[PDB]
């Protein structure tokens, strides 16, 4: 239904209304983003990874991911975290004031966030948060360093891997 970061997104459930909101990045730039308000589920289909995303307003509730290799799974996770519009993803932006240009009639801020994190997702992964996980057979944790764990995971994130 739409393409974002190389994944085909389809909404499978729920609805949202869009409210324009100014947000402040970690490096103190202002982005004016269309915040989606409501409960939604999406599928994400890539060449090398597939995910199920459950989200609410600026909140990743669950992401289940399967993929070819560590790189392919990290790609899905980064796109999902930007799509979530979470405040910790907005605050993970650091470094050059790259969102200040204004040359184009309109420069999509969610695309700007994804392009930022495609350069380096270390700050994003390190600030997202980790949680203890239940023992669900075939579901493993993935740590900020993209290492598997049976005990902990990035908040809301599980890899489907036997
Ligand atoms: O807002 C936009 O300009 C585009 C770009 C940035 C993310 C989506 C894909 C590209 C967005 N397009 C669409 N988003 C959504 C959408 C629903 N809930 C969401 N929550 C967060 C989010 F972020 C986008 C959405 N629905 C239909 C779309 F067609």
């Amino acid at each position: 239904s739409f393409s974002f970061g190389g994944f085909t997104f389809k909404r499978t459930s729920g609805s949202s209304v869009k409210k324009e909101e100014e947000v402040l990045t970690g490096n103190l730039q202002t982005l004016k983003i269309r915040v989606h308000e409501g409960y939604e589920e999406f599928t994400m289909v890539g060449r090398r990874a597939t995910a199920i995303l459950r989200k609410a307003t600026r909140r990743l509730i669950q992401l289940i991911v399967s993929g070819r290799d560590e790189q392919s799974i990290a790609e899905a996770i980064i796109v999902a975290m930007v799509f979530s519009q979470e405040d910790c993803m907005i605050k993970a932006v650091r470094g050059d004031l790259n969102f200040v240009n204004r040359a184009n009639q309109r420069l999509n801020p969610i695309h700007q966030l994804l392009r930022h994190f495609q350069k380096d997702a270390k700050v994003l992964f390190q600030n997202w948060g980790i949680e203890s996980i239940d023992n669900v057979m075939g579901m493993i944790g993935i740590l900020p360093d993209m290492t598997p764990s049976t005990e902990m995971s990035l908040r809301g994130i599980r890899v489907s891997k036997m």
Side-chain angles (χ1 to χ4, degrees), residues 2-4 11 16 36 40 42 55 82-85 108 110-111:
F2 60 88
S3 189
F4 185 58
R11 189 163 67 190
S16 62
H36 287 259
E40 294 164 307
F42 294 86
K55 71 170 293 282
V82 168
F83 185 85
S84 78
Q85 304 181 314
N108 184 306
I110 303 300
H111 272 109

Side-chain angles (χ1 to χ4, degrees), residues 8-9 11-19 21-33 35-101 103 106 108-111:
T8 306
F9 277 77
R11 189 163 67 190
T12 55
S13 79
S15 62
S16 62
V17 298
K18 317 183 285 281
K19 193 208 136 209
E21 193 175 318
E22 290 186 315
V23 301
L24 197 59
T25 65
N27 57 356
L28 304 179
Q29 307 178 93
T30 295
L31 290 180
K32 182 186 188 137
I33 65 160
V35 178
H36 287 259
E37 301 193 296
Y39 302 140
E40 294 164 307
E41 193 168 333
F42 294 86
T43 57
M44 291 164 67
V45 177
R47 293 269 305 274
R48 294 169 309 281
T50 302
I52 306 157
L53 168 61
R54 302 185 214 169
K55 71 170 293 282
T57 310
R58 307 200 58 202
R59 186 156 62 95
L60 188 155
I61 297 171
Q62 187 175 69
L63 183 78
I64 305 302
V65 190
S66 61
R68 185 180 74 183
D69 50 45
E70 291 212 328
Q71 184 46 48
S72 288
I73 291 160
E75 288 177 17
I77 289 175
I78 294 168
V79 176
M81 281 171 179
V82 168
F83 185 85
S84 78
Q85 304 181 314
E86 284 220 13
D87 183 61
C88 64
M89 171 275 303
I90 293 304
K91 293 301 190 279
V93 176
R94 304 302 159 71
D96 288 354
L97 305 176
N98 283 341
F99 296 164
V100 181
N101 42 79
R106 40 231 258 271
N108 184 306
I110 303 300
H111 272 109

